[PDB]
Scaffold this motif. Structure first.
Motif, mmCIF file in Angstrom:
data_model
loop_
_atom_site.group_PDB
_atom_site.id
_atom_site.type_symbol
_atom_site.label_atom_id
_atom_site.label_comp_id
_atom_site.label_asym_id
_atom_site.label_seq_id
_atom_site.Cartn_x
_atom_site.Cartn_y
_atom_site.Cartn_z
ATOM 1 N N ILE A 34 1.189 25.974 5.581
ATOM 2 C CA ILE A 34 0.379 27.176 5.686
ATOM 3 C C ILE A 34 1.120 28.271 6.442
ATOM 4 C CG2 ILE A 34 -1.795 28.064 6.705
ATOM 5 C CD1 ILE A 34 -2.209 26.158 4.323
ATOM 6 N N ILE A 59 1.687 25.025 10.848
ATOM 7 C CA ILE A 59 0.431 24.469 10.394
ATOM 8 C C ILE A 59 0.573 23.947 8.990
ATOM 9 C CG2 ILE A 59 -1.982 24.998 9.878
ATOM 10 C CD1 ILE A 59 -1.730 27.124 12.050
ATOM 11 N N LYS A 60 0.098 22.745 8.729
ATOM 12 C CA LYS A 60 0.078 22.113 7.451
ATOM 13 C C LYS A 60 -1.341 21.717 7.080
ATOM 14 C CE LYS A 60 4.765 20.760 8.302
ATOM 15 N NZ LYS A 60 5.329 21.798 7.371
ATOM 16 N N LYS A 61 -1.710 21.743 5.827
ATOM 17 C CA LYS A 61 -2.947 21.275 5.335
ATOM 18 C C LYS A 61 -2.730 19.993 4.577
ATOM 19 C CE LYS A 61 -7.038 22.567 2.611
ATOM 20 N NZ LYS A 61 -7.633 23.717 1.871
ATOM 21 N N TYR A 78 -9.898 17.191 3.973
ATOM 22 C CA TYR A 78 -8.580 17.603 4.422
ATOM 23 C C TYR A 78 -8.575 17.668 5.947
ATOM 24 C CZ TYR A 78 -10.331 22.075 6.031
ATOM 25 O OH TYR A 78 -10.998 23.048 6.745
ATOM 26 N N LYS A 91 -6.134 20.087 8.895
ATOM 27 C CA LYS A 91 -5.005 20.945 9.203
ATOM 28 C C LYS A 91 -4.362 20.434 10.463
ATOM 29 C CE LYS A 91 -6.414 25.032 6.749
ATOM 30 N NZ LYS A 91 -7.271 26.213 6.937
ATOM 31 N N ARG A 128 -1.161 20.926 13.312
ATOM 32 C CA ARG A 128 -0.274 21.866 13.912
ATOM 33 C C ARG A 128 0.842 21.128 14.592
ATOM 34 N NH1 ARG A 128 -3.039 24.498 18.560
ATOM 35 N NH2 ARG A 128 -2.298 22.561 19.549
ATOM 36 N N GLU A 167 -8.312 21.368 12.550
ATOM 37 C CA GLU A 167 -9.379 21.788 11.646
ATOM 38 C C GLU A 167 -9.566 20.722 10.567
ATOM 39 O OE1 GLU A 167 -9.111 25.830 9.854
ATOM 40 O OE2 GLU A 167 -9.600 24.697 8.086
#
Ligand SMILES: O=S(=O)(O)c1cccc2cccc(Nc3ccccc3)c12
Length: 159
Positions: free
Chosen positions: A44, A53-55, A66, A68, A70, A87
């Motif tokens: 992301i 940040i990755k989802k 999902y 998220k 960091r 998240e």
């Protein structure tokens, strides 16, 4: 408040190679080797260091859609990786974040030991219970074993 959990896992793969694959290349490897556990990983924001940040999306039928994650810190010398779930999934009005730390240590037999710490930061002291911890451990073990198997089978990968 904070709920702290520590565990260890073992691997037959040497530490540096396992770190390179399981940590530094998880966005590519996890959906490849464990499609039944991880449907995709999206970058992301960020270029791989602190704050990236990755989802991470889960397959249909899983408890969560999902999360998220960091990146907090990445130590390429000592094979230490810190990241937080910020998240999705369990995060919301009862849970602010999960802060995680992994260290991979070499063993003399040519394997490694993974030292894992998870800290759940709750809002309004909503008890974190054994069932969530069990689930997270099962996912981590599934991913580790899938990556291990891939590294055993593909000798030229990640040297
Ligand atoms: O941290 S993880 O990345 O999921 C993880 C990664 C790799 C191996 C793991 C083995 C056991 C538990 C884990 N997680 C875990 C979950 C909750 C409490 C304590 C450990 C593992």
């Amino acid at each position: 408040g904070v709920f702290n959990y520590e565990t260890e896992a073992t691997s037959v793969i040497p530490a540096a190679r396992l770190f390179k694959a399981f940590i530094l290349d998880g966005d590519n490897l996890f959906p490849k080797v464990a499609p039944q556990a991880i449907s995709s990983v999206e970058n992301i924001e960020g270029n791989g260091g602190p704050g990236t940040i990755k989802k991470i999306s889960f397959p249909e039928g899983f408890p969560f859609k999902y999360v998220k994650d960091r990146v907090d810190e990445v130590d390429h010398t000592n094979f230490k990786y810190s990241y937080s779930v910020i998240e999705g999934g369990p995060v919301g009005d009862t849970l602010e974040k999960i802060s995680n730390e992994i260290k991979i240590v070499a063993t003399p037999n040519g394997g490694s030991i993974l030292k894992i710490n998870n800290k759940y930061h709750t809002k309004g002291d909503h008890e974190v219970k054994a069932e969530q911890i069990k689930a997270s451990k099962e996912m981590g073990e599934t991913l580790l074993r899938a990556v291990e198997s891939y590294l055993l089978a593909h000798s030229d990968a990640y040297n």
